[PDB]
Design a protein around this nucleic acid. Structure first.
Ligand SMILES: [Mg+2]
Ligand SMILES: [Mg+2]
Ligand SMILES: [Mg+2]
Ligand SMILES: [Mg+2]
Ligand SMILES: [Mg+2]
Ligand SMILES: [Mg+2]
Ligand SMILES: [Mg+2]
Ligand SMILES: [Mg+2]
Ligand SMILES: [Mg+2]
Ligand SMILES: [Mg+2]
Ligand SMILES: [Mg+2]
Ligand SMILES: [Mg+2]
Ligand SMILES: [Mg+2]
Ligand SMILES: [Mg+2]
Ligand SMILES: [Mg+2]
Ligand SMILES: [Mg+2]
Ligand SMILES: [Mg+2]
Ligand SMILES: [Zn+2]
Ligand SMILES: [Zn+2]
Ligand SMILES: [Zn+2]
Lengths: 127, 214, 81, 25, 91, 97, 97
RNA sequence: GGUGAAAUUCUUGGAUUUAUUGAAGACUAACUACUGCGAAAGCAUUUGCCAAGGACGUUUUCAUUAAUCAAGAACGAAAGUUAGGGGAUCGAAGAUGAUCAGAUACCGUCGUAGUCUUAACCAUAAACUAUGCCGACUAGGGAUCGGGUGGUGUUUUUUUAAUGACCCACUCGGCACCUUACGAGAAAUCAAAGUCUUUGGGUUCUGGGGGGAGUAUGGUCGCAAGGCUGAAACUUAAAGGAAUUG
């Protein structure tokens, strides 16, 4: 009933990414991250930020011509934490409650048929 | 002080034949400028859309489909096919402990000389009265299944193009043909064609491509 | 238990045991005369063949080798002696 | 001291005596 | 009667040049003087003469090869690889 | 396998090994099937092949060198061709070959 | 002295299983000694699901959990997750809840 | 970007993110379990080939051919060493950012060797069940793995069978768990660690207070690193084990 673009939220710890793009993917439309709405490093991934940035993104999204979207939420992954970080949670709500539409959202976290030695050595990151 | 928004040319995406709709969405390019244009440069891209969204019914929530643009004629850009996928969440659900996984694949050709690698997955099932709490098969069981899945997969492909193969997968005939030969070996549940990743096509051929639209 | 007749074990509890752990040991296989009514005569088979026993005149088949007990083939009759 | 650090302590010790002794070969 | 504990053909050099170089030579020397199987006639009668030239005693075919051994690891993989690449082109 | 067939022949039939004597056999309409080593040079192969066709004798291209053809026939030397003369108890003659 | 019949954890008749990497500190740890957990949870969350459905297309949609199996390193598994530490007896008990 | 927080770092080179496409080398996620196999080290994608094996079945065959083993030998995680290839990743060394009284570290970055493979070495690990092997006997219970037998068992339909998976009973041989203890033990615990002052089935190996010390020396193996063999003088009243209360 709308005009569909793609959402794609990368939301690891230390920062959260939101940016809508063409349903094909190639041509982007609007972005902004957590590290763009507060200055403190320490607070780069926290919900309160991903909010204020999911706000910014929604604005441009409907200022160019996208009325809706599908999201692909995603973590760091690879040979790392494979778990959803703090701010995708918030940003999802902050972009639906924005007054945009939602339709079909799968996780696209890179999960290998495992390997390439994980970092941090055999004894693990110890402290 | 630019804003490339007041600068990009707009397009609308039309899918191929054998589904419900073909109108899927919109896209942004750039002005068909002299030297590097809105034509040849891009368009030839790809689009993932849950085929339920282009089949209507929700008995198709999983199953992702790749559409690729090969031709374009005045704002109207027509796609054909690039592959098929599964939703990550679906798969991660039909894989449970206490049971056997079974995967098997084959690289194979079609009439319209497309090469493709197609996948298939299946899991053991408990008998409808089975007391023991796991149910795995017997490795000899597994070898036997795969060889027969493979027997049936090569059969379907080299059916008329991906075109009828496209028509073939959609009502998941294959899934049950498997389960038929199968039943003589070992129970099993789920059983899907899961994935297929294309990977080699012949030569453009404006004819046959145009022969998907009207 | 504590006092029982080891000398006269009951036929059942005796029967359920292993072929070597009976009182005095002995086999638990058997022989049979077998006929596939294409012919008229009766060839004597072993319940645990191994060899796929080739019938008398007509090289038809008869039984197939298995885990233990032979699988007799199709339309055939027998008797244990 | 850790056993294995002591095992290394004397591994080295023998190398020096192994050395100094060669001097006189 | 075993004549030498380890220098082998390399005993001609006496004490000279230092073990480790003699080691390295002894290898290719053994490689390079040896008698090899002939692809064409089947008898083991290929001997070297000047690097990369391998010839058959009877039957007399000469092959180019490694400086000290008939077939070279690289040459061989390259044989395997061309094979594979050729396969595509009529299949 | 084929060697297993060859073996039956070599232990219960009659045969001859080597270029010259199978030629005698081929001229003589006596060969029932000649067998040929891989590395046997193409000129020889071609000639045997011609001698063969002229005598309506069939031909097996043994995938393997003379060295192995020899071990095939159970002999500690190497043979480039074998000539089946009589097929002992084996079905070589009237199977896939 | 000894403190568990399962010694560390779960390997009777094998000699070598294979290390996994701790999900938290990346410590290597044998797969049988490994402390695991299925992190089956929704994509949305607590009260976000109302807002979810409401500002969506379709009716009610579907809603598919995330699934990912967790591996902890003992020290990590003790430091936060499942562990506590139990009495000498409560240790013996393998039932979960 | 990274962390408890930072910083070294990366950024008109459009970084980070996105998209299509490719190359390299490693790995085998999820399924994976108180589940399998192997002499042990160890072994998880598919497919073909090559030979190997236990258990079971057996009115087959030989007929004492066997048990265990100084000497001697095959194999032997990881690292390490030689000569090629490879060199994505992670990463002894080194260099840095930080922290610290200091900080040669823990944490962050760069990253040599290495990590992979071929042809040779090396022969060691808490190489662990810290528990030799062969044989007998002694006590209950529910699971599971492989084999076999029994069943007018269930389910698959087609037209009933035949299959296959499932269910129940028993029986061999597996990996384990439960409960008891006749019994054993310094206890913790133990179906062997039981059948021992009521002390003998067969056989191999090692220990004899603690340090000195796996040191010195000789021999031997190794390219090396090091392996195997391996003392004494002198010193010393304890060192040690399991359990209890603090
Ligand atoms: Mg800590
Ligand atoms: Mg001097
Ligand atoms: Mg204590
Ligand atoms: Mg303790
Ligand atoms: Mg071990
Ligand atoms: Mg796998
Ligand atoms: Mg010895
Ligand atoms: Mg001696
Ligand atoms: Mg490297
Ligand atoms: Mg340093
Ligand atoms: Mg400093
Ligand atoms: Mg230092
Ligand atoms: Mg040792
Ligand atoms: Mg242990
Ligand atoms: Mg018992
Ligand atoms: Mg049965
Ligand atoms: Mg005193
Ligand atoms: Zn008959
Ligand atoms: Zn020659
Ligand atoms: Zn950890």
């Amino acid at each position: 009933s709308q005009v569909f673009g793609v959402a794609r939220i990368y939301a690891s710890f230390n920062d959260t990414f939101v940016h809508v793009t063409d349903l094909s993917g190639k041509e982007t439309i609007a972005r902004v991250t957590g590290g763009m709405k507060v200055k403190a490093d320490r607070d780069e991934s926290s919900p309160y930020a991903a909010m204020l940035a999911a706000q910014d993104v929604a604005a441009k999204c409907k200022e160019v011509g996208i009325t809706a979207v599908h999201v692909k939420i995603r973590a760091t992954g690879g040979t790392r934490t494979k778990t959803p970080g703090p701010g995708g949670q918030a940003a999802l709500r902050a972009l639906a409650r924005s007054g945009l539409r939602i339709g079909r959202i799968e996780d696209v976290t890179p999960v290998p048929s495992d390997s390439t030695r994980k970092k941090g050595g055999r004894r693990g990151r110890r402290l | 002080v630019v804003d490339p928004f007041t600068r990009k040319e707009w397009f609308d995406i039309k899918a191929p034949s054998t589904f419900e709709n073909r109108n899927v969405g919109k896209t942004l390019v750039n002005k068909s400028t002299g030297l590097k244009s809105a034509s040849d440069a891009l368009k030839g891209r790809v689009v993932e859309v849950c085929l339920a969204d282009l089949q209507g019914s929700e008995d198709h929530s999983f199953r992702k489909i790749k559409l690729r643009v090969d031709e374009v004629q005045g704002k109207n850009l027509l796609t054909n096919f690039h592959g098929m996928d599964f939703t990550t969440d679906k798969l991660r659900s039909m894989v449970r402990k206490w049971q056997t996984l079974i995967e098997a694949n084959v690289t194979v050709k079609t009439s319209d000389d497309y090469v493709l690698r197609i996948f298939a997955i299946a899991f053991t099932r408990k008998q409808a009265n089975q007391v023991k709490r796991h149910s795995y098969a017997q490795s000899s069981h597994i070898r036997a299944i795969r060889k027969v899945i493979s027997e049936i997969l090569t059969k379907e492909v080299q059916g008329s193009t991906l075109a009828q193969l496209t028509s073939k997968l959609i009502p998941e005939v294959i899934n049950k043909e498997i389960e038929n030969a199968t039943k003589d070996i070992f129970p099993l549940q789920n059983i899907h064609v899961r994935k297929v990743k294309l990977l080699k096509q012949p030569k453009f051929d404006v004819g046959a491509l145009m022969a998907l639209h009207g | 238990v504590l006092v029982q007749d080891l000398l006269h074990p009951t036929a059942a509890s005796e029967a359920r045991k292993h072929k070597l752990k009976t009182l005095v040991q002995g086999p638990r296989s058997y022989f049979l005369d077998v006929k596939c009514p294409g012919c008229l005569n009766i060839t004597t088979v072993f319940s645990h063949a191994q060899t796929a026993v080739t019938c008398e005149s007509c090289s038809t088949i008869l039984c197939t080798p298995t885990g233990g007990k032979a699988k007799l083939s199709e339309g055939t009759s027998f008797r244990r002696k | 001291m850790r056993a294995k650090w002591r095992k290394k302590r004397t591994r080295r010790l023998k190398r020096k005596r192994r050395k100094v002794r060669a001097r006189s070969k | 009667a075993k004549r030498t504990k380890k220098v082998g053909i390399t005993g001609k050099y006496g004490v000279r040049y230092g073990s480790s170089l003699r080691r390295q030579v002894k290898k290719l020397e053994i490689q390079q003087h040896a008698r090899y199987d002939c692809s064409f006639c089947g008898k083991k009668t290929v001997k070297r003469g000047a690097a990369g030239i391998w010839t058959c005693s009877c039957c007399k075919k000469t092959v180019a090869g490694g400086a000290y051994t008939v077939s070279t690891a690289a040459a061989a993989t390259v044989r395997s690889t061309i094979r594979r690449l050729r396969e595509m082109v009529e299949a | 396998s084929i060697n297993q067939k060859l073996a039956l022949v070599i232990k219960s039939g009659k045969y001859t090994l080597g270029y010259k004597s199978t030629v005698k056999s081929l001229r003589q309409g006596k060969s029932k099937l000649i067998i040929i080593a891989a590395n046997t040079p193409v000129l020889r192969k071609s000639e045997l092949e011609y001698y063969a066709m002229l005598s309506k004798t069939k031909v097996y291209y043994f995938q393997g060198g003379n060295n192995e053809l020899g071990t095939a026939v159970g002999k500690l030397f190497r043979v480039g061709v074998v000539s089946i003369l009589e097929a002992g108890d084996s079905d070589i003659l009237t199977t896939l070959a | 002295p000894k403190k568990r019949a399962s010694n560390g954890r779960n390997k009777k008749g094998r000699g070598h299983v294979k290390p996994v990497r701790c999900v938290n500190c990346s410590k290597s740890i044998p797969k049988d000694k490994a402390i695991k957990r299925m992190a089956i949870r929704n994509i949305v969350e607590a009260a976000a699901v109302r807002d979810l459905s409401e500002a969506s297309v379709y009716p009610e949609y579907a809603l598919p959990k995330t699934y990912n199996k967790l591996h902890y390193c003992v020290s990590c598994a003790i430091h936060a997750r499942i562990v506590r530490v139990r009495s000498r007896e409560d240790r013996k008990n393998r039932a979960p809840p």
